[PDB]
Nucleic acid binder design. Structure first.
Ligand SMILES: *[C@@H]1O[C@H](CO)[C@@H](O[C@@H]2O[C@H](CO)[C@@H](O)[C@H](O)[C@H]2NC(C)=O)[C@H](O)[C@H]1NC(C)=O
Ligand SMILES: *[C@@H]1O[C@H](CO)[C@@H](O[C@@H]2O[C@H](CO)[C@@H](O)[C@H](O)[C@H]2NC(C)=O)[C@H](O)[C@H]1NC(C)=O
Ligand SMILES: *[C@@H]1O[C@H](CO)[C@@H](O[C@@H]2O[C@H](CO)[C@@H](O)[C@H](O)[C@H]2NC(C)=O)[C@H](O)[C@H]1NC(C)=O
Ligand SMILES: *[C@@H]1O[C@H](CO)[C@@H](O[C@@H]2O[C@H](CO)[C@@H](O)[C@H](O)[C@H]2NC(C)=O)[C@H](O)[C@H]1NC(C)=O
Ligand SMILES: Nc1nc(=O)c2ncn([C@@H]3O[C@H](CO)[C@H]4OP(=O)(O)O[C@H]43)c2[nH]1
Ligand SMILES: Nc1nc(=O)c2ncn([C@@H]3O[C@H](CO)[C@H]4OP(=O)(O)O[C@H]43)c2[nH]1
Ligand SMILES: *[C@@H]1O[C@H](CO)[C@@H](O)[C@H](O)[C@H]1NC(C)=O
Ligand SMILES: *[C@@H]1O[C@H](CO)[C@@H](O)[C@H](O)[C@H]1NC(C)=O
Ligand SMILES: *[C@@H]1O[C@H](CO)[C@@H](O)[C@H](O)[C@H]1NC(C)=O
Ligand SMILES: *[C@@H]1O[C@H](CO)[C@@H](O)[C@H](O)[C@H]1NC(C)=O
Ligand SMILES: *[C@@H]1O[C@H](CO)[C@@H](O)[C@H](O)[C@H]1NC(C)=O
Ligand SMILES: *[C@@H]1O[C@H](CO)[C@@H](O)[C@H](O)[C@H]1NC(C)=O
Ligand SMILES: *[C@@H]1O[C@H](CO)[C@@H](O)[C@H](O)[C@H]1NC(C)=O
Ligand SMILES: *[C@@H]1O[C@H](CO)[C@@H](O)[C@H](O)[C@H]1NC(C)=O
Ligand SMILES: *[C@@H]1O[C@H](CO)[C@@H](O)[C@H](O)[C@H]1NC(C)=O
Ligand SMILES: *[C@@H]1O[C@H](CO)[C@@H](O)[C@H](O)[C@H]1NC(C)=O
Ligand SMILES: *[C@@H]1O[C@H](CO)[C@@H](O)[C@H](O)[C@H]1NC(C)=O
Lengths: 777, 773
RNA sequence: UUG
RNA sequence: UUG
């Protein structure tokens, strides 16, 4: 097909509509900007390389650049790899950017720069210098940024990237940047709010600094400000996972009552970790539009019981009062002020880490009439007692979250969220059952025993999360009787005792059941387990039974008219299917609608004959990955007449079938990565017209000849993976080298990991760049 | 040193006292008996190879052989590898053994043999033909075994190795084997006890067969028999993990009341899985010496409550009545007959799988006066209730085992349910004193009074319960003598630094696999709880996912071993955060620290300085370590063992001696090392063990590996590298061929990878004369 | 690779 | 390899 092979070690994309030529050289172990970058290049990304300098020659030809992303070519020592530390800061020579008349966005984050780079074109809207070593801002260094709208300067002086002094900002440094919308000075050891800021700011980020006091006029002119973040100034340091220095005398960040008076447009106020003890209502006198308020990680335990300020927040969407508990105090109950009832717009309330013994219905009465309330998060509260029936008054909610408690008789937050330093930190790369309906999340509690009356009045629930409790009982179909509407039960990380084949049958509308990581009782010999419990679940679509160490079953067959997906990863089918024992060879046969089966990680070093014949007739998607498979009778695929995806990754296979078409007419996706294949059979893919995806990566293949890979098949492939093999680039490889260079077929990692290993001369050389003319003399 | 390199791909060992020359060729991927086997060879082992034939030429020179072990050179299809199936049964030519005048023991197990091999010498005392295809025994084929004392014939016809007929034994086939002591016909599809057996038998194994009936005279003459095993005839098949066919009519193995009358010497009787419903006392009328009786996997639930037969067993040491429960019956309690009191010699009583709701003190009264009772096993009984205090009447016992029950206020894990627990392959806190094992119960909450009257306990096993409480040092008050607590696989909440402090005599604490509360942010954990445990020697806190700690230091005057595998020291030691760099410093007598599997891709500076002063043994394995500042080992002045296995290191120190003068054992296996530094081992005289296996080393020169060091090494591991066998390698190849230093796998995995000619060739066999022209 |  |  192609007349001119692509040798450039970067992905090139065309977006004809937006007039964009996108060149992505992310993480290509470059020590130089590569030659041959298209002249029409608009967006060039060189992040995570080791290019030690920029010069007028760097971008000479590239006069149409709108965006240069040159991040993380010299990451500060403690932020970067300890195996490849950058020896000297990036050097930017004069005039490197002044010729780029159309340049809108420049990212120079993570390059150990000492100063704001000069000579930047007046087109620039966005400049980013995070994770550098710039800790003095002078008005004179900013005159070049007349048109700048977005300026990121954070992470230039903090514990991971120290500068060993206070940050310095000259008076009025930013004032004459008349179009500046977004200013970020986070994580920078700043001691005062810099003034005067231009009145065009929409977003101001001042968090994780050393600001002890806000002056009453610090935000006087910012009548367009929408987002203000002052978090992590006078931090609450208890159990902090980073070095944390509090303000002296347990002082809060001191905020005058009239500090916010000019912020009539403010939508987001973030006061996380400011050691606040009071929230004066006078703060919010002139902010009628505030939508999001974060007051997490303070000392507002008393204030939550008073909270006059809430009367001024009728448009608030999101309130977070998490982790406000008094140290070494365990309150008897949660005292929510009546003032919460005035939060007419509230969709999301989070109050983790209040820390109290007993939740009772009346304590939530202030919320009964919040019509728009969607999420109530009372996680990580060490609640010992809670009658779940109280949530009958909360049918309108999408999520009731009691995760991480001590109870016994629409996006999830990262596992580190309230305690991390900077949850918005940008990486060097880049720049759940809620969907089923009403969710009650009781995960990570101390529930040892359940009975029907625990769920009295909760028939509206679509999802119940019981993950990570202590449930050890012989469920018999009597325990969830009220849960008539339940579509999803997550029962993972309990100790299910499957003595009874009637377990879960009362959940007549159950579509998905997760009983993964319930291995306990499956580890002891002589215990009766009824894997045939599936028969009674008439609308079950998906069953997850992973990591259960299942090596025995009293019943011989699982049956279902409905089940489409079975995850059975991390069990011991090798023990059930011991060579000579026929009894379990039809375990899955009567799952008549099953399409997806995952039996990876079952220590299946071989498959006894009868396994494939025993498969249910409509199996589409089979994983046998990570089994230590040392042999495989390819012909047995003939029994799986609807097989579309076969995953055999991470095994010990040494051969492919002589003729894949003769094994399976239906197979579309063949994953063979991470095996021990050293050669392909002569006619491997001959007439395999249905094949669309083939992964032969991370094998030991030396040679590939034309006969194995006919062109009428290769042309149908959406992707062919060949990387990390042992290719021999001798004159015997002429066809393969030619074909790789010239094909239109998508083959990933040509630039990094489709490499000759030999002979001598060409060792470590990309096959895409290989010249074999000496073979044609 | 050596003048003649050892090229034979087998270990050769000398035992001068017994005049033995031991040649072990186990698992050497041989397809031929190797040449050059010493002429003086007495014991030759060729197990797990693919040698397709034996012939007169096989052992011609080896006239002094006493033992040939030639097992598993052609394993039956379903018993063997499916990746290397044996194509044709072993072929044994005539006269292969008749020249071996001194041959005492021949093992030919696992070779797909169809017949008993003939032409065996009259010296033979032991013949073994397990896992063959010999399923008809003819008197004529046994005449050659006049002097045989031990004959193994089992596993020749069973579900893993089927013969598709009944086993056949001709009448009196064994009678004229006048010195036969041990006969094993297990796992063979035998239908009747073969008769007449010789009266010299000490041991008869007939288990896992199809014997429905014992005739009254089957064992008439066996007045020397010590062990009889008839188990697995009319099996109890409930929840069996193998294909199991019961006797028709739910029948037991039928044993007439006088069948054992002649067995005056019997010490062991095994009647496991015989579907017995009754144990007639008349069985044991003439056996006063029986010591071991296994009656597990029967239907003797009612019989346990009666059990008149026990009155005839005053010398019994070991009784097993495990897995005798009636299907779908969950008894209220355990009914032990008063007859148990007559078992004056009993050391070990096992009654798992009785299956009952509540154990009460009175129910064990029949045992109160068994003076020698050492082990009481009531595991896998689904007991819901048991007052632990009842065991105050049992201080004399070594182990009280309530493992796998349902209580709430060592045998292989498969034992009672496996087919043949004595099958031959081709190739714990009891020690501390009184042990109460409550592992795998449903204990959610504990308090001091649960342990009332149990102050004598030395080991308590609470492993695999549901304990989720903030232990505060009040919960084990009575357990004043406890030396070992296994608290693994619970949900310890380490809120309180006073946890466990009441166990004033605790030497070992295991709180491994208590990760639960360590997985959620904002929870207070006090790792400094070690301070209060004044005699603690060993602390195991593996697989706890520990990534946060309210306290900054662990302290102990006593602790010698800390296992901290499978945690998140990488998070505690984030580059820039100094606060936890002395976590272990104040464990002043610590000698062994295991911080493998802590995702430590690098070690921040200060880690080594923060190590306690007497550290001898440090594991940093399986951390994905990509770099390592070897010079920092200077801080570990007492370091003897450094384990850096399974990492991504690419280099060794320029000079190991300049890093550590104390280091004896350096484990670097499974890294990415491609070359050694020029002077690597110069003057590191006290180095004794070096493992460089599974790396990418191409060349090793004498400067890196001076001989004044290498010769002192007890072991040097080099296998699975990328050795380039050019003329540059002359020294290394010479030294490897000639050294006395132990180097494992020379015969199998110390290989050239090039150039061309020598690719895949063993370094030990490499001829490099062309380099010396 | 006699489980 | 800014968490
Ligand atoms: C190419 O560069 C331009 C400008 O740097 C990018 O345009 C930005 O796109 C994002 C989309 O998330 C918008 O939010 C910004 O407001 C745009 N800025 C400008 C000045 O146009 C464009 O995204 C880049 N394209 C690629 C593929 O990287
Ligand atoms: C933030 O600035 C403070 C000073 O305002 C820095 O603290 C100084 O650090 C040097 C070296 O650590 C010391 O000699 C001085 O004693 C410190 N002064 C004070 C007042 O504490 C601090 O290092 C800066 N933080 C970072 C991470 O760079
Ligand atoms: C070498 O072969 C002899 C002969 O088979 C072995 O000696 C026997 O070892 C068994 C195993 O415990 C003893 O119980 C016998 O009493 C020994 N004597 C005889 C004559 O059988 C000897 O152990 C073998 N040595 C090795 C290391 O394999
Ligand atoms: C043990 O012997 C029995 C016969 O007593 C074998 O069973 C016969 O096997 C063939 C083939 O499976 C059948 O056609 C016969 O009907 C069987 N006879 C009976 C009486 O069942 C059995 O296969 C043998 N067991 C093993 C493991 O080899
Ligand atoms: N798994 C299980 N959990 C129990 O709680 C139980 N109680 C009695 N039993 C009996 O023990 C036998 C082995 O588990 C089971 O078989 P059963 O005779 O039907 O009755 C069962 C229990 N089994
Ligand atoms: N780990 C733990 N387990 C508990 O059961 C508990 N109850 C209250 N608390 C309090 O919650 C805080 C966060 O773990 C702890 O700090 P405290 O305020 O000293 O008291 C503790 C508990 N902590
Ligand atoms: C709740 O707390 C506030 C503290 O401001 C207190 O004034 C109020 O009376 C408390 N109410 C209850 C029900 O405890
Ligand atoms: C839980 O509250 C409900 C009413 O919502 C009531 O029916 C039930 O009895 C309560 N249960 C307990 C144990 O308090
Ligand atoms: C249930 O909770 C666990 C633990 O919090 C979480 O990992 C899991 O994703 C949740 N399950 C669903 C279905 O959302
Ligand atoms: C299930 O268990 C409950 C426990 O109270 C019992 O009422 C019910 O009868 C049991 N179900 C069956 C099928 O026995
Ligand atoms: C499951 O199998 C058992 C036999 O082991 C049978 O008695 C029980 O009724 C079966 N249950 C279903 C739903 O098939
Ligand atoms: C096959 O199943 C796996 C999970 O087992 C899934 O990730 C994958 O997308 C499926 N493939 C197709 C083609 O549906
Ligand atoms: C495989 O190959 C042979 C020859 O084309 C043919 O006879 C046989 O039917 C084929 N089987 C399948 C399932 O394609
Ligand atoms: C357990 O037995 C002891 C006597 O050994 C007694 O002191 C205690 O009260 C008993 N516990 C219960 C709950 O009956
Ligand atoms: C405690 O019981 C567990 C679970 O059976 C067992 O694995 C462990 O080895 C026992 N602990 C000790 C210290 O022997
Ligand atoms: C620990 O908790 C116990 C049991 O609830 C409590 O009564 C006691 O005061 C505490 N003990 C110690 C040693 O602090
Ligand atoms: C452990 O550390 C905490 C504070 O971090 C302290 O309150 C406690 O007393 C310490 N305990 C011991 C035993 O050192």
């Amino acid at each position: 097909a192609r007349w001119f092979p692509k040798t450039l070690p970067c992905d090139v994309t065309l977006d004809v509509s937006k007039n964009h030529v996108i060149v992505d050289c992310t993480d290509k172990h470059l020590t130089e900007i590569p030659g041959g970058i298209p002249t029409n290049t608009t967006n060039l990304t060189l992040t995570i390389n080791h290019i030690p300098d920029i010069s007028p020659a760097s971008f000479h030809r590239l006069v149409h650049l709108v965006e240069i992303d040159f991040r993380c070519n010299c990451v500060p020592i403690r932020l970067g790899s300890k195996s490849n530390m950058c020896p000297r800061r990036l050097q930017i020579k004069p005039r490197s950017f002044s010729g780029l008349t159309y340049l809108k966005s420049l990212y120079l984050d993570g390059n150990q720069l000492l100063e704001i780079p000069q000579g930047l074109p007046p087109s620039l809207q966005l400049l980013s210098l995070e994770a550098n070593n710039i800790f003095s801002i002078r008005k004179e260094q900013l005159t070049e940024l007349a048109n700048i709208e977005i300026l990121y300067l954070g992470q230039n002086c903090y514990y991971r990237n120290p500068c060993y002094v206070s940050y310095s900002i000259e008076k009025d440094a930013f004032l004459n940047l008349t179009k500046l919308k977004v200013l970020s000075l986070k994580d920078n050891n700043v001691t005062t709010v810099p003034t005067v800021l231009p009145s065009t700011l929409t977003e101001l980020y001042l968090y994780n600094n050393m600001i002890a006091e806000i002056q009453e006029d610090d935000f006087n002119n910012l009548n367009q400000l929408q987002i203000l973040d002052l978090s992590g100034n006078c931090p609450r340091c208890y159990n902090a996972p980073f070095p944390c220095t509090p303000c002296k005398n347990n002082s809060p960040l001191q905020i005058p009552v009239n500090a916010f008076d000019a912020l009539t447009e403010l939508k987001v106020l973030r006061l996380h970790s400011n050691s606040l003890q009071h929230v004066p209502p006078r703060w919010f006198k002139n902010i009628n539009n505030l939508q999001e308020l974060d007051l997490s990680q303070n000392f507002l335990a008393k204030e939550i019981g008073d909270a006059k300020f809430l009367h001024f927040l009728p448009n608030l969407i999101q309130l977070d009062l998490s982790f406000n508990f008094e140290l070494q105090v365990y309150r008897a109950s949660m005292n929510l002020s009546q003032a919460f009832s005035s939060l007419k717009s509230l969709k999301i309330l989070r109050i983790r880490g209040y820390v109290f013994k007993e939740l009772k219905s009346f304590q939530l009465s202030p919320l009964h009439n919040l019509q728009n309330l969607e999420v109530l998060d009372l996680g990580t509260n060490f609640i010992k007692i809670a009658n779940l029936s109280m949530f009958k008054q909360f049918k309108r909610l999408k999520v009731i979250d009691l995760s991480v408690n001590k109870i016994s008789p629409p996006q999830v937050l990262e596992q580190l969220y309230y305690f991390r330093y900077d949850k918005y930190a940008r990486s060097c790369r880049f720049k759940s059952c809620y969907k089923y309906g009403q969710t009650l999340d009781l995960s990570k509690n101390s529930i040892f025993f359940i009975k029907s009356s625990d769920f009295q009045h909760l028939s509206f629930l679509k999802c119940l999360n019981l993950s990570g409790n202590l449930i050890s009982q012989t469920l018999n179909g009597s325990e969830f009787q009220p849960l008539a509407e339940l579509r999803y039960l997550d029962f993972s990380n309990n100790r299910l005792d499957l003595l009874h084949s009637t377990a879960f049958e009362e959940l007549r509308k159950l579509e998905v059941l997760d009983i993964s990581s319930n291995s306990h009782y499956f580890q002891s010999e002589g215990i009766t387990h009824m894997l045939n419990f599936t028969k009674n679940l008439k609308v079950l679509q998906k069953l997850m039974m992973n990591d259960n160490d299942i090596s025995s079953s009293t019943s011989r067959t699982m049956e279902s008219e409905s089940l489409r997906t079975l995850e059975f990863r991390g069990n011991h089918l090798d023990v059930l299917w011991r060579d000579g024992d026929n009894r379990y060879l039809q375990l899955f046969k009567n799952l008549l609608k099953l399409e997806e089966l995952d039996i990876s990680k079952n220590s299946l070093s071989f498959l006894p004959s009868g396994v494939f014949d025993g498969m249910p007739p409509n199996l589409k998607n089979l994983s046998l990955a990570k089994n230590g498979l040392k042999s495989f009778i390819w012909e047995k695929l003939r029994y799986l007449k609807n097989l579309e995806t076969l995953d055999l990754s991470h095994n010990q296979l040494t051969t492919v079938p002589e003729r894949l078409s003769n094994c399976s007419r239906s197979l579309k996706n063949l994953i063979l990565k991470n095996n021990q294949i050293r050669s392909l059979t002569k006619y491997f893919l001959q007439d395999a017209f249905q094949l669309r995806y083939l992964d032969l990566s991370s094998n030991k293949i030396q040679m590939i000849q034309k006969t194995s890979f006919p062109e009428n098949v290769l042309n149908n492939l959406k992707m062919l993976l060949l990387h990390h093999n042992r290719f021999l680039c001798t004159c015997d490889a002429v066809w393969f080298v030619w074909w790789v260079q010239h094909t239109e077929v998508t083959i990933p990692y040509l630039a990094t990991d489709v490499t000759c290993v030999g002979p001598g001369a060409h060792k470590g050389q990309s096959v895409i760049s290989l010249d074999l003319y000496t073979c044609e003399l």
